[PDB]
Design a protein around this ligand. Structure first.
Ligand SMILES: *C(=N)[C@H](C[C@@H]1CCCNC1=O)NC(=O)[C@@H]1[C@@H]2[C@H](CN1C(=O)[C@@H](NC(=O)C(F)F)C(C)(C)C)C2(C)C
Ligand SMILES: *C(=N)[C@H](C[C@@H]1CCCNC1=O)NC(=O)[C@@H]1[C@@H]2[C@H](CN1C(=O)[C@@H](NC(=O)C(F)F)C(C)(C)C)C2(C)C
Lengths: 306, 306
């Protein structure tokens, strides 16, 4: 037992990070087979980033201007192109550590691990959720751009996020690996604001099931509710609507505990209307919404990857 | 900016996990050069674990009774011995992925990452602290024994924990890599209780400094305090005494923010006596004590390992 904010093992991704330098700008790149993916603003000077024309800036660069190092070994660049906000550098050496992988575009509410990197070397790994406003609550410093977020499924790494920028209240924005931003953000140094966030209701329910499985049951009440009634309450507290799709995904946890999804909605409704009254759930004094139903199943059943 | 419960990258340790089977019991082992380290109760049947005589049980085993697999490849065992609560299996093949490593015995209040594993394959990584009562608040299921905890420093992995058992309230107990238990616990299935926990005061202060660096400053008051006076208050709230050694270790964060350690003690004292009043610090509604001063420095300065 016990329940922790668990990240995926990072080894498969650590084998793919490299450092990319153009001029005096250095950030991280992702080396898969014979291509290096990195944020396109590696081609910017400081001044360029206020209002860059990336297509213009790239026209003036040639292969040899990109310095790619895997550890201390330089990888010779033999071609380059831009796909939305990501640069693709073809190199003359395939990465022998390339895992089975996919590029995926994740949906708001889904979680992934981030391997935070500087100068092509990993600093740490942590779990994140794509918020409903298309930001993530990460931990990123200068030089962390090109760090990636991923999920693993058996042996296959699904890369879902590349880090690009930080937004006013210390939240973070980035792209999928085809260079398309999550949310309405652009890679330009100008005032930009995320929309209002909302709580990922299906994830809060998943976490309450994790609590019950770990023996933390005080919040369970004797009532049930309709889907419609619950969603009326949730709206008032800035919770996402719960859909039948979400109910179906919660099915495995419901069947494990014997607690119907709508009964656990009645318990959540009481928590939202009355608060938790100085009490904790799974050691937390706030309701947690960064575990998906699949994350709870994985952790409570011991799913592995190797 | 941002501040997250960050784990070390696990790749160096993932290369060392193997599965060890004796009879019908399977758990995880750690393969470094030509030795596999694993918990000694792999030699137990279910019934043996109520009151085992490990020296007796081991006398009746020979090398070939230990089935060691690195992935699907069996590693031939050519010798075996017991060192306290750990078994050391010599194998006829050195692990080519062995990192630079040390075995260390950590002190209460220090943190480490856990690579949770089943059948020799990694499930996830998370950060933990050795509590003052010599337990850790982990996430471990049946089959996770032999999972290890570690720190990294540049290129050197310090292994500090091997997982052995779970204690009444869902907390966890284990050994260092020389087989010596942290705390008064034994590897026998009998009722055992951890002592009362206490809050790691130096770590709470480190985390308040992390808050200030991230711009969360509401709790800073205009006062100072003596070390002696602060420790009188902390005792009442079950906080560890703060020593001059702890003050010295907080020096780098103090110098970075310009906030003397004793001034931040005055702010913590007010939080303990008055509570946080519905407010959060770094997104938390409780004071957090699982970041050491070094963890804060590492994360806020972007220290890497590769
Ligand atoms: C890439 N290494 C950095 C990562 C930042 C750096 C600041 C701290 N936290 C991070 O995640 N990315 C950039 O610096 C990025 C680049 C330039 C400006 N920029 C920003 O993140 C800026 N954000 C905005 O201007 C916007 F969000 F208001 C700030 C945080 C002001 C530097 C470009 C090319 C968008
Ligand atoms: C090793 N794979 C397991 C890990 C456990 C299993 C239960 C769930 N969480 C874990 O960490 N270790 C054991 O099973 C261990 C072994 C046997 C009994 N034991 C325990 O952990 C037991 N604990 C106690 O008996 C004591 F703490 F009260 C329980 C949790 C009751 C199985 C030995 C050889 C100590």
């Amino acid at each position: 037992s016990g329940f922790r904010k668990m990240a995926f093992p990072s080894g498969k991704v650590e084998g793919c990070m490299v450092q990319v330098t153009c001029g005096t700008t250095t950030l991280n790149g992702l080396w898969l087979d014979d291509v290096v993916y990195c944020p396109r603003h590696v081609i910017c000077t400081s001044e360029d980033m206020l209002n860059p024309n990336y297509e213009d800036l790239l026209i003036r660069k040639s292969n040899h201007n990109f310095l790619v190092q895997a550890g201390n070994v330089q990888l010779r660049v033999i071609g380059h192109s831009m796909q939305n906000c990501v640069l693709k550098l073809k190199v003359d050496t395939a990465n022998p550590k390339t895992p089975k992988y996919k590029f995926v575009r994740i949906q708001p509410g889904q979680t992934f691990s981030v391997l935070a990197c500087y100068n092509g070397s990993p600093s740490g790994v942590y779990q994140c959720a794509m918020r409903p406003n298309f930001t993530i609550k990460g931990s990123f410093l200068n030089g962390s751009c090109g760090s990636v977020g991923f999920n693993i499924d058996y042996d296959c790494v699904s890369f879902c996020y590349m880090h690009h920028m930080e937004l006013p209240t210390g939240v973070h924005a980035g792209t999928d690996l085809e260079g398309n931003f999550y949310g309405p953000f652009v890679d330009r140094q100008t005032a930009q604001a995320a929309g209002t966030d909302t709580t990922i209701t299906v994830n809060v329910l998943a976490w309450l099931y994790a609590a019950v499985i770990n023996g933390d049951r005080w919040f369970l009440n004797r009532f049930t509710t309709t889907l419609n009634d619950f969603n009326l309450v949730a709206m008032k507290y800035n919770y996402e609507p719960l859909t039948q799709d979400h109910v179906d995904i919660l099915g495995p946890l419901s069947a494990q505990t014997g607690i119907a999804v709508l009964d656990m909605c009645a318990s959540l409704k009481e928590l939202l209307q009355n608060g938790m009254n100085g009490r904790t759930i799974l050691g937390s004094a706030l309701l947690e919404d960064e575990f998906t139903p699949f994350d709870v199943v994985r952790q409570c059943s011991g799913v592995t990857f190797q």
